[PDB]
Amino acid sequence: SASAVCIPIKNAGFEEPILQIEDDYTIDTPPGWITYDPGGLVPAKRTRITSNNGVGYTGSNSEFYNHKAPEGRNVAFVYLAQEIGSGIAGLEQTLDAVLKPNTKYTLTVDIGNSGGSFQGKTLDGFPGYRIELLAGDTVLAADHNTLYIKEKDFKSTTVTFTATPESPYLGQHLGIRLINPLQGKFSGVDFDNVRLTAEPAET
């Protein structure tokens, strides 16, 4: 951890684009990230009532969380309007760094369970979450909904992965997926503070 190094990630805290009004949010894919929608659940033209993703201002007076964003003023969100078990969707980003042998990777991200209500619709419930670390288009490691996150709360999850010399994915581009697996309603989940460190692998 003392010799840990950070792997560069674009818009890691979803601080772009800048917002100012409490509870304000966009419905466009946050800059630096791309929408992960293998089942085409996110419409070409998005509206506030369709499946969508974006950044949301989360200050100390947020209606959805007891505290402000874990990092900065913004958190990213992924909302799916389809029925439970209809599929999965989220944010994804390919990194410049490649997988190196004898290296332990530590991927940490804060998961938010929005609570309260919006326009008469309750935010009670949670669709779960899944964090993935990739090499190429292969999922090296993932944590699927193991954390318990209370409503209006944010919780840190950690995904580790050690690349050995026998790995077949050495030299492939690293990647990160923030997924909403749609396993419950209200089907919205927030993320923030994406961090990816690398260090010498365990002896």
Question: In the complex, which residues of this chain contact a second copy (CB under 8 A)?
Answer: 84-85, 104, 124-126, 132, 138-148, 150, 159-162, 164, 166-169, 183-185, 201-202
Rounded distance between C-alpha atoms, residue 198 and residue 102, angstroms:
10
The entry of Ca ion, a second copy, none that residue 95 binds, CB within 5 to 8 Å by partner kind:
none
Going from the C-alpha of 154 to that of each of 24, 42, 64, 170, the distances in angstroms are 18, 25, 11, 34
Closest approach, Cβ 3 to a second copy, in A, equals 16
How many Å apart are CA 194 and CA 36, to the nearest integer? 16
Kindly tell me which of 19 and 133 has the beta carbon lying closer to a second copy: 133
**Which residues fall in the annotated binding site for Ca(2+)?**
13, 15, 71, 74, 113-114, 123, 125, 151, 192
* HSE toward the beta carbon, residue 158, CA cutoff 13 A: 6
Report, in Å, the least distance between residue 21 CB and a second copy: 29
CB of 103 to a second copy, least distance (A): 11
Is the distance from CB of 23 to CB of 64 less than 8 angstroms?
yes
Select from a second copy, Ca ion, none the partner in contact with residue 72, using the beta carbon and a kind-dependent cut-off of 5 to 8 Å. Ca ion
Task: Map tokens 């419905």 to a residue.
Answer: 27
Which residue number, 63 or 173, has a Cβ lying nearer to Ca ion? 63
